[PDB]
Structure 1
Amino acid sequence: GRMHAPGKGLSQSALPYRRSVPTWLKLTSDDVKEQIYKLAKKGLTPSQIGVILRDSHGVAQVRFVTGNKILRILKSKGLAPDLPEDLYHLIKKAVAVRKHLERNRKDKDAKFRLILIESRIHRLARYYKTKRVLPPNWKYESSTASALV
């Protein structure tokens, strides 16, 4: 179930058994990679890149075409985001909640939600520091969070 919610939803993606490039996809590996580079240069996260390639270019799974994952491709090319996308969005949400709390101090539910979001941020940051994606000196601050976003 959800880490910070009582819900236990089953909704997710179901990858098909076949790992081969679909017959309708005439795009080559280098064509898909160039598409990924162009989308990344627009400032799109790998999730957005995958969604756009799925919804418009017929790319069912970038991994099965290019043999590599979107973040791995962007890291190889060298234009990957400094801090990982999920951590970036968690920090963005925490900054938004703190900005809201600055003007609404009686919003105790917002305070509870901020506590939960910051706990998620700390768990993700600890994981990333374990894997050396983030420097060991990296620390999320309640006073200087809006500089990482």
Structure 2
Amino acid sequence: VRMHGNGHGKAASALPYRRTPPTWLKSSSRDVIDAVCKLAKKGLSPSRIGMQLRDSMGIAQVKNVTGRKILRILKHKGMAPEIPEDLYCLIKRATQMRKHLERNTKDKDTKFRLILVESRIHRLARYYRRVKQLPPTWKYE
């Protein structure tokens, strides 16, 4: 079940059993790392980088060729984002809701949904502090 709702969804991706590259690929490991580094220089998130390679370059499951996950590649080159991307995207949504509520005070439904989002932020930030991905004494607001 969803953690903050009543939906029972199952849409997801199923990964292949065979992890070896498909032998029609070319595009050696060095070229893939170059393409990842070029894209991150344009401000694309780790999730958007995997999409661009998948849809236009034939690279599915970047880990399977070059053996390294996308975030690890960016950390090594020193271009990782300051805060994790899931936390950043939750914070952006809560900011837009709050800007809307300042003009629409009677929107009691968006007030209920804002409580759920901020409960998600406080649960996530507690985790990133325990595994030292965020500075201690980091506070949302």
TM-score (norm: length of structure 1) = 0.92
Tell me what 1:106 maps to. Answer: 106
Q: Describe the superposition over 1:16-66 as per-residue Cα deviations: whole angstroms up to 9, x where unpaired.
A: 001111223211112111111111011000000001111111111010111
Tell me what 1:51 maps to. Answer: 51
Tell me what 1:9 maps to. Answer: 9
Structure number with greater CO (CA < 8 Å, separation at least 6) is 1
Tell me what 2:39 maps to. Answer: 39
Instruction: Structure 2: give runs of 5+ residues left out of the alignment.
Output: none
Q: Describe the superposition over 1:88-114 as per-residue Cα deviations: whole angstroms up to 9, x where unpaired.
A: 000000101111111111111111111
Instruction: Structure 1: give runs of 5+ residues left out of the alignment.
Output: 142-149
The 5 Å alignment of 1:1-149 reads 1-141=1-141
Q: Describe the superposition over 1:101-142 as per-residue Cα deviations: whole angstroms up to 9, x where unpaired.
A: 11111111111111111111111111111110001111101x
Tell me what 1:146 maps to. Answer: none
SS for the counterpart of 1:4 is coil
In the alignment, the residues of structure 2 paired with residue 25 and residue 115 of structure 1 have an alpha-carbon distance, to the nearest angstrom, of 48
Cα RMSD of the aligned pairs, angstroms, is: 0.8
In the alignment, the residues of structure 2 paired with residue 78 and residue 36 of structure 1 have an alpha-carbon distance, to the nearest angstrom, of 13
In the alignment, the residues of structure 2 paired with residue 24 and residue 85 of structure 1 have an alpha-carbon distance, to the nearest angstrom, of 33
Identity %: 69
SS for the counterpart of 1:13 is coil
Letter in 1 for 2:62: V
TM-score (norm: length of structure 2) = 0.97
Number of positions where the alignment pairs a residue of Structure 1 with one of Structure 2: 141
Moved >6 Å (runs of 4+): none
